[PDB]
């Protein structure tokens, strides 16, 4: 009774398709294979169930490819979306029975192709904490360095997908003077300061 | 989902929210990092006895029913290798799961207050002409169990606003998170909230940070 | 001391008030009517394991430590012959005991509200000249667990007044008690209380019946 | 390992003495015998401890008579009071040991000798409930019958010791009219009504 998933991570863009592999192994004669997904808020949701006696089970945007002669089963998620970013588990399995899970594969969904836009950075203070705010920009090649002669801490930027399909980033940093600090950006071969917005 | 932060050689209560009428067996699963969810035990409810796994002696796991159709898994003599996410499950086919409960087992290395402490920010003055909008920023820090949930609400409504969080970055022994929200033009000068759910939040009630115009 | 009124085939939590720093073993005694106090089990606290008696299998008694130096005995699969007073004890020589906790195991034969309902009385008009005094009377009725405590207090003080209770007489399926107090001449026209402690009170807080002049 | 107490109840008046018996039986060579008392509010209080190797243990108003050749031990409560009304237990008995209790004897303490006084009864109503109140009277020979043509219930009287050393009694009773009801008393060969107090 073993379930093997030798896939660490996958990256597939929006409205494409993805196949996930699951090598089960058992000695029973009639079993079921369940598929579960785990949100980052730690919730398990039943996706699809493949009974090992009748043909391929599909339910909406999910499809299961079953190789009974081999030991391979495969989940298809067609027409991907933005909340298909989870961790997916293969389970093997009347009220007393247990499910045997695999180690789980992670699907990270990337946005589509967009023309390049420009950052338009800002800055905001709280006495000693600063925060450079970068507005929407499509390619993820960003460098959000700040300017201060007196540096204490500088955490990493946090790039996240906007609801427009582009990216936003915040980079915190604690300094002493915290008033003569102005952030800069090296996005897409053209430097963007924050003094042109100031006046 | 929440967190539990008991020390070593202690007892921990883990309750699950899965409300089901006329159950027969309640399974208990454990998920650790880079491993699989394994069943620890399952509790008969028509006979009230635990059936354990092939690995440990009795005197470690106990299923307590405080009321009818409510279950708590009590762990005993906590060791540092007991930490993970604990689910409860029932059959129907499918097997429903119970939203998880992280348990953290520490050596009492806190020694201070570990409540999330906000240091909120205000939108810049130049953003509020050439964008017709403004952005808040709600930085939290110095909180230990790391199961935290920041969501933004209106001045008086029940809507969840389009916040955009960040990664729970780790300091030398504590943690730090920040969330931020962009609001449009004609809903700008109102009040906004930065509700923060956490375990080591004073009086049990979660925080509620009010944001100016 | 209080009462616990769980039904058959249920679970019961029995906590003891005996607060002792650096205990080693916590014994648990049971006293039934016309019998002797016998030890059920004792709980090691440096190893966290129960040592039972020569009479029953495990899966019935469990000692839970919710906090440090606090203990709860959880009973499981309650039968009607489990009802009695439960103490907890520690050695020092002498053996201190822990104020008792009555457990009543019924077959859910209540079917209504079983809170104590007062029907208070006032002193007679002829008593209040030829005795320079007056007497109250505070009759309670229709309450099931019968572990009730009536005591009288002043309008604003922390004194216990010289009340004189009666026997907890039994109706057809409920119970009934009455207490009464005599007050002297120059403390007569004030306010008085008939505080009633019981398990099946509303919201857990005990009653407080105010008495007129 | 047995402890026998063949005494159901004792009645002894104030400032007298009482002996309670306890037949223990054991096979140990060194043991202790503890005495406990139980209030009606269910509280166990340690009274006295007799070590079976040295002489008779006394502590204040308690004294223990020890017969090592026989199996008899005996507690003396000299100069009795009013809160010596409890149930007394004999126990037999390093941190792991258990105590073996007996079935327990009950001591009910009676007041002293007083001259006879007279009842002086009253009455108090709540619409349908009545209650005859009897003031202080020393000998407990009371009969607190009420008068009504329309009777529903009549509970028993509750005779209790006053702080003056005499007795008070309340007898409830539910009736319909509940206004023309007047209680009477047959205490000590002289009938006491409640109409002489009314005017």
Numbering used by the authors:
A (entry chain m), D (entry chain M): 22 to 114, 119 to 224
B (entry chain n), C (entry chain N): 11 to 102, 111 to 231
Excerpt from the paper describing this PDB structure:
Gamma delta (γδ) T cells, a unique T cell subgroup, are crucial in various immune responses and immunopathology. The γδ TCR is a heterodimer comprising TCRγ and TCRδ chains, discovered in the mid 1980s9–12. Each TCRγ or TCRδ contains an extracellular domain (ECD) with a Vγ/Cγ or Vδ/Cδ domain, a membrane-proximal connecting peptide (CP), a transmembrane (TM) helix and a short cytoplasmic tail. After antigen engagement, the γδ TCR–CD3 complex triggers the phosphorylation of ITAMs within the cytoplasmic tails of CD3 subunits, initiating downstream events.
